[PDB]
Design a protein around this ligand. Structure first.
Ligand SMILES: O=C1CCN([C@@H]2O[C@H](COP(=O)(O)O)[C@@H](O)[C@H]2O)C(=O)N1
Ligand SMILES: O=C1CCN([C@@H]2O[C@H](COP(=O)(O)O)[C@@H](O)[C@H]2O)C(=O)N1
Ligand SMILES: O=P(O)(O)O[C@H]1O[C@H](CO)[C@@H](O)[C@H](O)[C@H]1O
Ligand SMILES: O=P(O)(O)O[C@H]1O[C@H](CO)[C@@H](O)[C@H](O)[C@H]1O
Ligand SMILES: [Zn+2]
Ligand SMILES: [Zn+2]
Lengths: 324, 330
C-alpha cells in the first residue's frame, strides 16, 4: 500500500491513491405521498406500489427553440429538449430500498424498465438516478428517484460511449464484460455475487465506498432484463444497500444512476459495445457524520482517495446482510 | 419561437476542459489561538513551533497526500488495470498572521506578498516536479476545518488529470489556429462584454461562457504569460488589486464570507520546462458553491454526477450581478 495513480478506462480519468495515509409514514402535505396535492394542483392517487408523475419544476422542457449556429469555435452551443419525471418507489415515506421487500423492489425495477422504454422512444438518453439523503441535497425524504430524458447525449454518456466503442474495436469484447470477467478472477474488489449480477468496488473508484453494479450477461439496456434477472437484481440491490446502511449504522446517503445504450433512433446504429450498469457514489468516509469532500485539489487537478478500493471492498464484504 | 439564452434551455461547450453543461435558463474567529497550528507561535502536529511570522508562512503539511519517495507499481498485465507511480510534496501557506482576516479584508501590499510567495514556491518546487498545484479551499462548506487564511500547494511527479485535459485542448487549439486558446478567449470576451466581471490594466475576470458553478469566475492576465513567476512587479500588484476587488464583490453578493475552491493553472514545469509551451496561458479558476443566499448552495449531485453539469442562472446573469456589486466590503 504505497501512493500511486490509477486509471478509469470507462470515463478516461486518473485518480490518486494515497494509500500511505424520524419520518412519518404519511404526510398530507408531502407532495409525493398518496392522496397529496402537487404543485400543479393535481391530487396523487391512492397508489400502493410505485408512482410516476411529471416534475412540476423541471430542468428540461420538451419544447424549446434551438440556439443559432455557432459563430466561433470557443463559443459553441446546441439545442436541448427533454422531459423530467419523478418516480415514487413505495407509498410509505418511512421506508427506503433496503427496508423494502424483494417483490416491492422488483416493482421498482419494472417501473425503471417501463419508463426507459417509454421515454426512449423519443429521446436518445434516459437518465434514471436517485439522490438519497440531505447530504446529497435531497429535501424530500419519501423514497423515490428521478428520470431526465434528453435530446442530447449528456457529457458522461459521451465519455462512456467513446471508451466502450474504442475498447470493443481494439479488443473484440465489451469493456465492462471483460472488466467483470477480470474482477471475478481477481476477487479482491468483489462485494456481492449472485446468479445474474455482481457488485464490486471499481479499481479506479473515487468515492470511498463507491460501487459498480452490473449484470453477468451482456445486456445493453434495462428493459432487456428477463424476469429472473429483475428479481435477482432486486435481491442483490437489497443486500448491497443493507450492507451500506450497516457500514456506519445509519441511512446511507448516495447518488446513483443507470447507464445503458442510447435509445432514440436505433436504425443504422450498433450498440454492442455497451453494457448496462449502475454507479453508486456515497459521500460518507469514516462515520455517519464524516464525509469526503470533492473540493480543492480534486477540482483543480485530480480525484484523490486514502482508503484503497481493496480495503473498501474488504469492509463491504464483511458487513451483514441483515439490516441493523 | 425565437431563442434567447436567458429564456430557453440549451447546452454549452467548455473547450478548455472538453465538457458540456446544461443551462436551464427557463427557471467569530479570534485573531490568535495558541492551539491553532497555523497561527504564529503555535505548535504543529509534528511538535514544531511556528515562528512569530508577520506576513506569509510556508511549511510542510504534517498529513500530506503525497510523499517525495515511493516505489513504483509493477507493470500492468491488462489494459483495464493501469497504475503509474506518484511522488510529490504538499505544503501549507498562511496568507497572513491574523486568523480573523481573509484575502478581501487584507491590504493590496499584503496580497502582493501572497502573490510573491505563490511565485517563489512555483519556481522552487517546479524545478523538481512537472506540476505545482496552488489551491485555496475556503469555508466549511468546502470542508476546510481551519479558518486561518491560507492555501495549499501540491507538487507532483505526474501531470494531473485536469492539467492533461487543458494541455491537450490548448495544444490542439494553437496547432489549428496559431494563437493560444485563452488569449483568443480573452480577446473575444473583451469584444462581447456581457460576461466580463472586472477589467484592469493587466488582468481580467469573467464568468466563463461554459461555467458550471453559479458565480464561477476565470481570472487571467491580458499578456501572454505561461507561468506565475513570469509576472512582472506591476502585474503582481495589479493581480493583488483585482483579486481584492473580485473577492470583495463575492463577499458582498450574499453579505457573508463567500466560500469557494480556487487554483492556478500554468505551463508544466519540471524536466521539460524548456520545451515549447507557447500554447499555455496562465489562469485561475474560482468555484463557489453558494447559489441563492449565504446558506443555499448548489449541489453537484445526481444528474450532474451521472450525466452532465446543470445550471439555472446563466453566466450572463451571474456576470451582470457581479459587475453591479460594490468594491467596498460590507
Ligand atoms: O409539488 C411538487 C414538489 C416536488 N417536486 C419535485 O419532486 C422532485 C423530488 O426528487 P428527489 O428529492 O430526488 C424534485 O425534483 C422536486 O422538484 C414536484 O415535481 N412537484
Ligand atoms: O498540525 C497540523 C494541523 C493541520 N495541518 C494541515 O494544515 C492543512 C490546512 O489546509 P487548509 O484548511 O486548506 C491541512 O491539510 C491540514 O492537514 C498540518 O499540516 N499540521
Ligand atoms: O487538507 P484538508 O483540508 O484536511 O483536506 C481537504 O482539502 C483536500 C484537497 O482539496 C481534499 O483532498 C479533502 O477532501 C478536503 O477535506
Ligand atoms: O431535484 P432537486 O432535489 O430539486 O435538485 C437536486 O437534484 C438535481 C439533479 O441531480 C440537481 O440538479 C440539484 O442540484 C439538486 O439540488
Ligand atoms: Zn457509467
Ligand atoms: Zn485551468
Amino acid at each position: 500500500d504505497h501512493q500511486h495513480i490509477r486509471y478509469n478506462p470507462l470515463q478516461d480519468e486518473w485518480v490518486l491513491v494515497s494509500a500511505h495515509r424520524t419520518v412519518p409514514r404519511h404526510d398530507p402535505l408531502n407532495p409525493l405521498c398518496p392522496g397529496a396535492i402537487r404543485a400543479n394542483g393535481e391530487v396523487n392517487p391512492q397508489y400502493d406500489s410505485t408512482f410516476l408523475f411529471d416534475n412540476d419544476f423541471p430542468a428540461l422542457q420538451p419544447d424549446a427553440p434551438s440556439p443559432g449556429p455557432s459563430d466561433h469555435p470557443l463559443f459553441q452551443a446546441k439545442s436541448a429538449r427533454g422531459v423530467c419525471k419523478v418516480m415514487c418507489f413505495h407509498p410509505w415515506s418511512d421506508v427506503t430500498l433496503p427496508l423494502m421487500s424483494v417483490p416491492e423492489i422488483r416493482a421498482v425495477v419494472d417501473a425503471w424498465a417501463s419508463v426507459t422504454e417509454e421515454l426512449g422512444a423519443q429521446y436518445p438518453w434516459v437518465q434514471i438516478f436517485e439522490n438519497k439523503g440531505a447530504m446529497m441535497g435531497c429535501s424530500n425524504p419519501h423514497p423515490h428517484c428521478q428520470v431526465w430524458a434528453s435530446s442530447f447525449l449528456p457529457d458522461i454518456a459521451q465519455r462512456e460511449e467513446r471508451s466502450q466503442q474504442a475498447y470493443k474495436s481494439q479488443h473484440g469484447e465489451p469493456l465492462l464484460m471483460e472488466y467483470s470477467r477480470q474482477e471475478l478472477l481477481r476477487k479482491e474488489r468483489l462485494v456481492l455475487t449472485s446468479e445474474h449480477w455482481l457488485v464490486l468496488v471499481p479499481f479506479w473508484a473515487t468515492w470511498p465506498y463507491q460501487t459498480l453494479l452490473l449484470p453477468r450477461r451482456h445486456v445493453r439496456r434495462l428493459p432487456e432484463l428477463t424476469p429472473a434477472e429483475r428479481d435477482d437484481l432486486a435481491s442483490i440491490m437489497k443486500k448491497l444497500l443493507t450492507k451500506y446502511d450497516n457500514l456506519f449504522e445509519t441511512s446511507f446517503p448516495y447518488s446513483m444512476g443507470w447507464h445503458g445504450a442510447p435509445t432514440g433512433s436505433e436504425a443504422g446504429a450498433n450498440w454492442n459495445h455497451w453494457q448496462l450498469h449502475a454507479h453508486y457514489y456515497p459521500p460518507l468516509l469514516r462515520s455517519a457524520t464524516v464525509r469526503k469532500f470533492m473540493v480543492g485539489y480534486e477540482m483543480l487537478a485530480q480525484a484523490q482517495r486514502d482508503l484503497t478500493p481493496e480495503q473498501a471492498a474488504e469492509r463491504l464484504r464483511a458487513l451483514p446482510e441483515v439490516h441493523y
